[PDB]
Amino acid sequence: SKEYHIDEEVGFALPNPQENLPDFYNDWMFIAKHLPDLIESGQLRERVEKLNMLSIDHLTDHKSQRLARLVLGCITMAYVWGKGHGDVRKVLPRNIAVPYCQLSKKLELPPILVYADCVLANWKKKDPNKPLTYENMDVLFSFRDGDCSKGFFLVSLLVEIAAASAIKVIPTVFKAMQMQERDTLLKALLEIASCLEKALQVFHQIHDHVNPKAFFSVLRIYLSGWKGNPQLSDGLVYEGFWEDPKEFAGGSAGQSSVFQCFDVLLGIQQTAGGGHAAQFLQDMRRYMPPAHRNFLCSLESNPSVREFVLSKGDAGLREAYDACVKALVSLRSYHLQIVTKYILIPASQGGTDLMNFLKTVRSTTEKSLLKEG
C-alpha cells in the first residue's frame, strides 16, 4: 500500500495524534478542553459567540489540521445541540463557521464532526512505551461528564485497529492472484479471517465501558447531524460561508473504511442497487478522508477475489474465503445485539428503519457465502 495514509500498526486511524495546537489557537482549545463544563454551566454558547475569527493559515501540517478539525468539530456540536435537551441553535457563528469550513474544504471533508475526527484522531496513549490497550489509552475530547464518549470512541478505535491487521495483507492477496500462487492466496485469506475474528473479541469491551442510558440519552445526542433531522429541518447555516443552510450527516462508525474495505475486497456488493442501505453506505464515503476513499476505490478496480476463488474447484480456497465472509456477518450480527441493547431498549423507556438497514447490510454479507447451498 502506498501513501493511502494507512499505518501498518494502526490502519485507518491517525498514528500518534497531535494533542496541542499553536498558541495562536488557545481560544479554541480552551473551549474544547472544557466543553463538559462550559456546556453544563451554560456559558458555552456565549463563549463561542465571543470568539474572534482566527485564521487557519497557522495550521501547517496534516496532524495539526486534523486536531483543529476535531476541536472545531466538537465545539460545533456542543454549540448546535447545547445541553442537548431540545434547545438547538440553527445558525453557526461566522467567527467559528468560517475557519471550520475553510479547514474542511482544505481537508476535503464536510464541516461537521466526522468519525475520522472523534475516533480516528481523538486518542492518545497514556504510556508511550506500552501497548495500545484500553487501559493505556484516553480520548482527547468529550462532550459531557459521564457521556461515555471514552468508552465509545476508544472501543471503536480498538476495533478499527484490530481490523487494521488484515489491511496489510490485501496486497499479498492480489499479488498471489496474478502470480497464480495458490498456497499464498489461501494463507492470506485465513490470516484476514483471523484478524476479523479477533476484532469481534475486541468488540466485547463495549459493554464494559458504555452504559446504555448515558449513551442513548447523551452521547447519541451530540453525535447527531443535520440531514433529514426534524429539529433542524433545512440544515444548519454556516454564517459567512454559505448562503443557505446545508445538510450533513452526524458522526457514525458507519463512516469506517474498515468494514467497507473488506466488503469490497471480498466482492460483497453493499454499494450496489438503488436501495436505501446502498445509498447510505455510498454516501458515507464522502465523510471519509480523501486518501481513504481513494483506497476504497483503488480496491474496486482490482480483479475479483471472489470470482477467482470460484473459478478454481479448490475447497481449501472457498473455505478460506468463506472464513472472511463468515467473520463479517459475525461482527454485524454482534453489532445488532449491541444496537438492541444500546438503542432499542433505551428508546423503549419508526426506529425500526434502523434495524432493517443493519439487517439488510448483514443479509447482503451472508448472501455472499459460497458453500452455503
Ligand code: HEM
Ligand atoms: C454503543 C454501541 C454502538 C451503537 C449503539 C451503534 C449503533 C449504530 C447504528 C444505529 C448504526 C446505523 C446507521 C447510523 O445511524 O449511523 C450503526 C452502523 C454501523 N456501526 Fe455501529 N454502533 C455501536 C458500536 C459500533 C462499534 C464499536 C463499531 C466498530 C467499529 C461499529 C461499526 C458500525 C458500522 C461499520 C456501521 C455501518 C453499517 C455496516 O457496515 O454494517 N459500531 N451503528
Ligand SMILES: [C-]#N
Ligand atoms: C456505529 N456507530
